[PDB]
Design a protein around this ligand. Structure first.
Ligand SMILES: [Mg+2]
Ligand SMILES: [Mg+2]
Ligand SMILES: [Mg+2]
Ligand SMILES: [Mg+2]
Lengths: 360, 360
């Protein structure tokens, strides 16, 4: 079986399990089951499945070098697929709720879930809640007797929480920290003193890297019973590095990739986001450029947004990006090498994760 | 130690643990820690703590009849308090997100969290996410080595999911099921054929009874290592009964308790909710009353809302409520008696849960 066709088949199985259980234990009626099926499909399907497929690919790497009965190989790959779906559904949760939080319009060239006519925010917030509850239902059903159940649940937990903390860091990244206060409407920063590489790295590390790279790698290890084949501090370091790179690419595309190809009209400039572009621009601009940036950033007005893009284009951020990129290559290669000391196999999976991130 | 002062002390401990951990492991800064502290306080404190205190009271009942070292008594009560906080924080999650979903204005005579000036929906949806993630952090930290950890996590999981399913049943209770469709904006029912006792009971069972009565009772059993002292099917039956009664009381108050005393301007009529009042009214109205109800229900217009309240007042729903009440007394008493066969202690805790619900 090709990995993807297996992965997609298990989607059907897991769907059927979840919807069957709603009928037999939760008193659901057919029409509400249908609503939930369409929600699941609309929110969980149609991406590249990169995160979920990482789990599968790590497990396949270990299968190639570890003796097992065929039934065991099948069970490991089935667990890797279920695990990969937990992560895809956790992402689906975050996208549903992030789109509502941000007032986003499109996602993957389609309307955000909450904007569907028969959804609305009222339902969509709860639909996103369900999306995350399904990850736990899947885990308890499919991994009930597995030795890795507690490790897997505890890891998932910690990554989920890191992610929500990262969301807080992201949505508050344009306020001055010393002014955060539930009682007082939050002004945009005027000094941009918190637009630094280190602050940017904290946002991205929590908001993206834990669920996008750490979780799939470690889940692949856990379903393979292979966590003792690796030095976990290196897995953390390499996940944090590659994830930061993925995010930097995303931040560049938000500004410069045509909307039809992006799947989205990017609004980071209007949202005053602490993006890689803003931080890198502020790390090289002269006084005059800084003052032009401050008078134009974080404003809906297209004239001001175009002034911000013009500033980015004249600031030659391609050079800063190539430099960042070369450094990331050095470091990711270094970490891949260190990972070979204990697991050539796993190092190779990480190389593959890196190639697919670096090329996309 | 009085139970409540213990319960509130553990709140402080758990707070400190969560915020300390954010500083030492999640790279949080002090101002964001403060924001989170104020959020926690604002969303978790100031109710009666009925749910969390049920856990404590069930555990205290078993302590009175079970031999234990003093250190063991203390550890059991500490676990009961932590468990009770998990439920309070799970409720806090649901209230934050429900208030945003419903566009609610007040809660406990204070603005809904999302309406605080320095919060906003953008942050509040994520704050509610965090509230639920903290329940898992608490569990993994405080119950790491406990024999009941898996049972407790799996129970919490199932109740959480039941709750979100119940929310879906509640928010969709005024649509015709056969018309649910993500693609089509949902009209209010015109026939009210789905306003039945059985449909009402399904909404309330999932939306409220599992987290409000089942979870606290069973968590008290699990932290006491006492789940084999009870017949679980009876605990389920009695929780479902008492919770339905609690909800019926809530539905009556939404319509008839003055807003200053309610903590809220109730909007169930304008929201076209499948309330106990609507169902009971439709179970006794004549043709003319039914037609007047249909032309006025589910409309913001205060004239139409007052026509609905007038209909309820003339329909003598106090008699239907006294009758419902007497029947609930019979059945809850019957179930308390059946619970004595295996655990007089637990039966008594359930009697106390019932008295505090029946009197409030
Ligand atoms: Mg966002
Ligand atoms: Mg982006
Ligand atoms: Mg609601
Ligand atoms: Mg109510």
């Amino acid at each position: 079986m090709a990995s993807m066709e297996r992965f997609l088949s298990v989607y059907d199985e897991v769907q059927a399990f979840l919807l069957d259980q709603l009928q037999s234990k939760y008193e659901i009626d057919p029409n509400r089951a249908r609503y939930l099926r369409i929600m699941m499909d609309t929110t969980c399907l149609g991406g590249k499945y990169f995160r979920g497929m990482t789990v599968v690919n790590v497990a396949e790497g270990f299968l190639a070098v570890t003796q097992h009965d065929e039934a065991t190989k099948e069970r490991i790959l089935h667990d890797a697929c279920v695990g990969g779906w937990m992560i895809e559904f956790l992402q689906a949760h975050y996208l549903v709720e992030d789109d509502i939080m941000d007032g986003s319009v499109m996602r993957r060239g389609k309307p955000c879930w909450y904007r569907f006519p028969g959804v609305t925010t009222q339902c969509a917030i709860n639909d996103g809640i369900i999306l995350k509850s399904w990850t736990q239902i899947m885990a308890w059903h499919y991994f009930a007797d597995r030795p890795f159940l507690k490790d897997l649940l505890c890891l998932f937990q910690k990554v989920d929480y890191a992610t929500a903390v990262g969301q807080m860091y992201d949505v508050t990244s344009m306020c001055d920290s010393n002014k955060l206060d539930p009682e007082v409407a939050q002004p945009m920063t005027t000094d941009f003193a918190e637009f630094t590489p280190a602050i940017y790295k904290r946002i991205v590390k929590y908001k993206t890297t834990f669920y996008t790279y750490l979780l799939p790698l470690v889940m692949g290890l856990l379903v393979s019973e292979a966590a003792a084949s690796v030095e976990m501090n290196l897995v953390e370091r390499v996940a944090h590095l590659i994830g930061e790179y993925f995010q930097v690419q995303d931040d560049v595309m938000d500004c410069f990739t045509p909307p039809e190809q992006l799947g989205k009209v990017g609004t980071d400039i209007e949202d005053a986001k602490c993006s890689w572009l803003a931080v890198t621009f502020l790390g090289k601009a002269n006084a005059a450029q800084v003052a032009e940036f401050k008078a134009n950033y974080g404003e809906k007005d297209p004239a001001k947004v175009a002034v911000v893009k013009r500033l980015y284009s004249k600031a030659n951020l391609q050079a800063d990006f190539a430099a960042y990129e070369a450094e990331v290559v050095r470091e990711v290669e270094s970490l891949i090498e260190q990972l070979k000391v204990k697991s050539p196999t796993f190092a190779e999976s990480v190389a593959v994760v890196w190639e697919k991130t670096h090329k996309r």
